[PDB]
Design a binder for this molecule. Structure first.
Ligand code: THP
Ligand code: CA
Length: 129
């Protein structure tokens, strides 16, 4: 897998963001995670977390997995990095997302994220409180 450039267009929520990729605007959905919707418990906190993580980054990058790169809604499916830190992993580590939507063929970072979730749960953080 490899990282590719992008630039933030706009925060959206815990697990989606509007980025410019290859010069085109796209909505990206984070692989392997599920954040609460904004109207649900910890939804606001998830959205705040990713808004800050994306807006503060000097360099956003996207990393597609081995499988399908867009979902049925036209959203890009990627691992997203903010100054080399994976947003997908950070969400899970903080108890602001669950590991979720693990489809074979696009699950390169599954075990990394499961390890984060375990530590979040051990610490009883957020969703796990
Ligand atoms: C994360 C992810 C979501 N999806 C689809 C499955 C779900 O379909 P349904 O909309 O039919 O439930 C939806 C979940 O996304 P959200 O959690 O953003 O709603 O997006 C994929 O197809 N591939 C993926 O890797
Ligand atoms: Ca969601």
């Amino acid at each position: 897998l490899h990282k590719e450039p992008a630039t933030l267009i706009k925060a959206i929520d815990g697990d989606t963001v509007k980025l410019m990729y290859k010069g085109q605007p796209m909505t990206f959905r984070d692989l392997l995670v599920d954040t609460p919707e904004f109207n649900e418990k910890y939804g606001p906190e998830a959205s705040a977390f990713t808004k800050k993580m994306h807006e503060n980054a000097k360099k956003i990058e996207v990393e597609f997995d081995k499988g399908q790169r867009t979902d049925k809604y036209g959203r890009g499916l990627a691992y997203i990095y903010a100054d080399g830190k994976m947003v997908n992993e950070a969400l899970v580590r903080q108890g602001l997302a669950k590991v979720a939507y693990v489809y074979k063929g696009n699950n390169t970072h599954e075990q990394l994220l499961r390890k984060a979730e375990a530590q979040a749960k051990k610490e009883k953080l957020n969703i796990w409180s």
